[PDB]
């Protein structure tokens, strides 16, 4: 393939990856991997060629780089032109000769390589103007629907003219422009703040959140009427439907509802079971355990299943159609 | 009992797939719930175009140095070719900057915001819905 | 050597890599966590052939085939040899072996032509009848 | 070259454990050359550039016993032919009868 190189030793034809001096190649010439991976202790190659007996012992963390003395240094240091490893394996002339920089990196006229994104970020990462040169940095027209500001940043268009300093340099807050008629608010779907030039969706006006950073939107809402029936009240002065009082959810926000869960006392028209469940008195003796604990039917006399029924040794009555 | 959808217990009894680590001894021999089966997965080895982290984690090569901690253990951003002083005062990051001990910075957005997909120095808003 | 010469198997307990496979024993053989090796046939048959019991961890028993007339399978999904089925020993700990269902006496053949029937559930050749 | 390693060839590094076991591991043989000479005696001789000691009779026997040749390079006397023999410029001893016989 064109991602490989072609050589013939005598008559046979061989194909080999075109990888650089900072990479290592494996058995069968199947794949090439960064040199630090060679002896890191993890079999990276498709075969055992990665860490054969030629690799010396390993003395540091996975993915790092090792030096011929017996010391390790991080891998991006390999050819930064400064000996981060005193052994001199770092900046080894053999490795830096025919140097090539990985895809996560960009290279400049200074024979230096910097992370690809660092380009045009106001810092001369190449140690010279090459990575910040306005000639190549200019004309970086970002995507449509976005806005571009003096900080050299691109931001959503909607984020313009809100007190959130999103561009960092306050460039997205042209106060004089923001207070112009074009920025004015749609009273039918939006809301405006008492001390700010900001507009928020009308539903947001009251939700328990300071949608206006001056807290001016929510100020109006206060109603929480504690209806006397079908409702329950909480220590923090909040009211919730009575059914919510004991359901395993802390609806009050202070657990005032759930902590008082004592089985409801049965009325004079009811009967009580082992789980203190309450059932109509008629259920106490009908030959069915309306309470799964058999509170009913255990005390009752051993009466018999009237006609059109079948009986079970458990003291149960079942329609004959069900019998077989 | 096919092994991926169903499970067989040491008692030569079969249990459904979800039961295998539901926390119940669905089969009385207690083979189900055994640590041998339930223990956490073996993370895949980092492939070409990726990077390795002390954390037993793999990060895409592009992410390896972008002022954001992608390895989780900061193993990605640590040790990049410094070049000029990467001081927070540059105000490169939109919302938050943290200066590293050895120089350089890592950036985070405020809650409800995540670093933008096309520019990790900028921030975009999480669609919590 | 692969044979427990110490009762605790401490001899083989520290054997080095015996084969470059990383395994301790060859094909047509079974290996145990004590680095002791046993004929595969002995797997899951009611005898801890490996002193540490690794030769019959019950999970292993499901795989071995057991033809019903020469071998027997127990409710524990473990296999036992034919003679063991009613030898009077719980060769398999579930006690399926020795069950009365299996051990009870045979069902006598029905009397065929040329034979005679007896109150005794017995058949007699017609000539012998008187 | 390497850490915890030995170097004996141009651009090559070899494990230290291999040195001093008689194995010609280094293609250039230096794995055995530097092993420290080890005391020996009782009729045996030891030679430079090797950690080997050999019977004294072998030292001057015309055989290269040590790879450096010290056993034959050291000073030892030559030999000459008997009265029953004849000598020629080849550094040879031949029977005296052969002195003049058209052969
Ligand atoms: C110079 C010398 O005699 N060195 C040693 C001697 O110390 C003794 O160890 C001997 C027997 O081992 O070998 C030789
Ligand atoms: C390697 O590290 C050790 C300490 O871990 C140090 O003594 C030695 O000098 C280092 N090697 C070099 C070449 O500086
Ligand atoms: C919106 O409401 C404000 C306050 O009542 C008012 O001053 C403004 O004229 C209104 N604008 C429109 C377009 O209705
Ligand atoms: C660069 O940063 C170092 C601290 O790491 C500081 O001492 C030095 O003064 C800085 N130099 C410049 C030019 O900012
Ligand atoms: C920066 O992050 C810290 C927490 O890491 C937070 O307390 C602070 O408010 C943030 N500041 C900005 C401007 O986002
Ligand atoms: C590896 O195992 C095989 C059986 O699968 C065995 O025959 C072989 O001898 C072992 N390796 C070698 C070549 O020693
Ligand atoms: C069975 O009980 C019913 C009432 O449920 C009647 O009393 C019926 O007469 C009883 N039958 C018998 C046989 O006692
Ligand atoms: C990852 O998986 C392999 C099998 O594919 C092994 O179980 C290995 O033990 C696992 N890795 C680690 C670090 O335990
Ligand atoms: C033991 O087994 C490991 C893993 O297979 C290696 O093969 C190692 O070389 C073996 N040890 C010896 C000394 O043979
Ligand atoms: C004889 O054998 C049959 C099956 O072939 C049944 O088991 C039957 O129960 C036996 N006869 C008697 C009398 O029990
Ligand atoms: C040489 O050695 C021989 C033995 O072969 C005789 O001793 C002879 O006398 C010697 N001759 C000389 C000249 O030394
Ligand atoms: Ca490796
Ligand atoms: Ca360096
Ligand atoms: Ca830059
Ligand atoms: Ca803004
Ligand atoms: Ca609000
Ligand atoms: Ca509740
Ligand atoms: Ca009832
Ligand atoms: Ca029924
Ligand atoms: Ca379970
Ligand atoms: Ca990163
Ligand atoms: Ca056995
Ligand atoms: Ca038995
Ligand atoms: Ca040697
Ligand atoms: Ca000699
Ligand atoms: Ca002659």
From Swiss-Prot, chain B:
In the inner ear, strongly expressed in the marginal cells of the stria vascularis (at protein level). In the female reproductive tract, expressed on the luminal side of the uterine epithelium (at protein level). In the adult brain, expressed in ependymal cells of the lateral ventricles where expression is restricted to the ependyma that faces the stem cell niche (at protein level). Expressed in neurons throughout the brain including in the hippocampus, limbic cortices and cerebellum (at protein level). Induction: Down-regulated in the kidney by cannabinoids, such as endocannabinoid anandamide and synthetic cannabinoid HU-210. Coiled coil: none annotated. Glycans are attached at residues 85, 96. It is found in: Apical cell membrane; Endosome lumen; Membrane, Coated pit; Cell projection, Dendrite. A fraction undergoes proteolytic cleavage of the extracellular domain at the cell membrane to generate a cytoplasmic tail fragment. This is internalized into the early endosome from where it trafficks in an LDLRAP1/ARH-dependent manner to the endocytic recycling compartment (ERC). In the ERC, it is further cleaved by gamma-secretase to release a fragment which translocates to the nucleus and mediates transcriptional repression. Disulfide bonds join 1-14, 9-27, 21-38, 46-58, 53-71, 65-80. Two overlapping PxLPxI/L motifs mediate interaction with ankyrin repeats of ANKRA2. Binds plasminogen, extracellular matrix components, plasminogen activator-plasminogen activator inhibitor type I complex, apolipoprotein E-enriched beta-VLDL, lipoprotein lipase, lactoferrin, CLU/clusterin and calcium. Forms a multimeric complex together with LRPAP1. Interacts (via PxLPxI/L motif) with ANKRA2 (via ankyrin repeats). Interacts with LRP2BP. Interacts (via NPXY motif) with DAB2; the interaction is not affected by tyrosine phosphorylation of the NPXY motif. Interacts with MB. Interacts with BMP4. Belongs to the LDLR family. This is Low-density lipoprotein receptor-related protein 2. It comes from Mus musculus. The lineage of its organism: Eukaryota, Metazoa, Chordata, Craniata, Vertebrata. The chain holds residues 3885 to 4013 of 4660 of the full protein.
């Amino acid at each position: 393939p064109d991602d490989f190189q072609t050589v013939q030793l005598r008559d046979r034809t061989l194909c080999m990856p075109m990888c650089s001096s900072t990479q290592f190649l494996c058995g069968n010439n199947e794949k090439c991997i960064p040199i630090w991976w060679k002896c890191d202790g993890q079999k990276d190659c498709s075969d055992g060629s990665d860490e054969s007996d030629l690799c010396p012992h390993r003395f540091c963390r996975l993915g790092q780089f090792q030096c011929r003395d017996g010391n390790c240094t991080s891998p991006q240091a390999l050819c930064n032109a400064r000996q981060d490893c005193a052994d001199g394996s770092d900046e080894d002339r053999v490795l830096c000769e025919h140097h090539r920089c990985e895809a996560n990196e960009w290279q400049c006229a200074n024979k230096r390589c910097i992370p690809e994104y660092w380009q045009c970020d106001s810092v001369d990462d190449c140690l010279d103007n090459s990575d910040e040169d306005p000639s190549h940095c200019a004309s970086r027209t970002c995507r449509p629907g976005q806005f571009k500001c003096n900080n050299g940043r691109c931001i959503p268009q909607s984020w313009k003219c809100d007190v959130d300093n999103d561009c960092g340099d306050y460039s997205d807050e042209p106060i004089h422009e923001c207070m112009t008629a074009a920025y004015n608010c749609d009273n039918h779907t939006e809301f405006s703040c008492k001390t700010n030039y900001r507009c928020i969706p009308q539903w947001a006006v009251c939700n328990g959140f300071d949608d206006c950073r001056d807290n001016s939107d929510e100020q109006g809402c206060e109603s929480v009427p504690c209806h006397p029936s079908g409702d329950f009240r909480c220590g923090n002065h909040h009211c919730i439907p009575l059914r919510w009082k004991c359901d395993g959810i802390d609806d009050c926000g202070d657990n005032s509802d759930e902590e008082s869960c004592v089985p409801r006392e049965c009325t004079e028209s009811e009967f009580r079971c082992a789980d203190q469940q309450c059932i109509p008195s008629r259920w106490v003796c009908d030959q069915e355990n309306d309470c799964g604990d058999n509170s009913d039917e255990r005390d009752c006399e051993m009466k018999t299943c009237h006609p059109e029924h079948f009986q079970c040794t458990s003291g149960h009555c079942v329609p004959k159609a069900l019998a077989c | 009992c096919e092994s991926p959808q169903r499970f067989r217990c040491d008692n030569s009894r079969c249990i459904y797939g979800h039961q295998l680590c539901n926390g119940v001894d669905d089969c009385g021999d207690g083979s189900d719930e055994k640590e041998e089966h339930c223990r956490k997965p073996t993370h895949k080895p980092c492939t070409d175009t990726e990077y390795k982290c002390s954390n037993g984690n793999c990060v895409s090569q592009h992410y390896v140095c972008d002022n954001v901690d992608d390895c989780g253990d900061l193993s990605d951003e640590t040790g990049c070719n410094l070049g000029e002083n990467r001081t927070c005062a540059e105000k490169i990051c939109e919302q938050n900057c943290t200066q590293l001990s050895n120089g350089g910075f890592i950036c985070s957005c405020r809650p409800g915001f995540k670093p933008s997909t096309l520019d990790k120095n900028s921030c975009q808003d999480i669609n919590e819905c | 050597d692969g044979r427990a010469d110490c009762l605790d198997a401490s001899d083989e307990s520290a054997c080095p890599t015996r084969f470059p496979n990383g395994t301790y024993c060859p094909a047509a053989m079974f290996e145990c966590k004590n680095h002791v090796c046993i004929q595969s046939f002995w797997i899951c048959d009611g005898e801890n052939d490996c002193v540490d019991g690794s030769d019959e961890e019950i999970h292993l028993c499901f795989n071995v085939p057991c033809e019903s007339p020469q071998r027997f399978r127990c409710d524990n999904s473990r296999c036992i040899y034919g003679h063991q089925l009613c030898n009077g020993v719980d060769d398999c700990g579930d006690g399926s072996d020795e069950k009365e269902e299996h051990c009870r006496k045979p069902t006598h053949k029905p009397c065929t032509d040329t034979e005679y029937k007896c109150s005794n559930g017995n058949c007699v050749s017609q000539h012998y009848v008187c | 070259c390497g850490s915890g390693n030995f170097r004996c060839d141009n651009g090559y590094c070899i494990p230290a454990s291999w040195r001093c076991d008689g194995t010609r591991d280094c293609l250039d043989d230096t794995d055995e050359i530097g092993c420290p000479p080890r005391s020996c005696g009782s009729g045996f001789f030891l030679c430079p550039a090797e950690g080997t000691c050999i019977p004294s009779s072998w030292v001057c026997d015309q055989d290269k016993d040590c790879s450096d040749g010290a056993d034959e390079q050291q000073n030892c006397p030559g030999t000459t032919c008997s009265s029953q023999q004849l000598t020629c410029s080849n550094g040879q001893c031949v029977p005296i009868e052969y002195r003049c016989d058209h052969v």
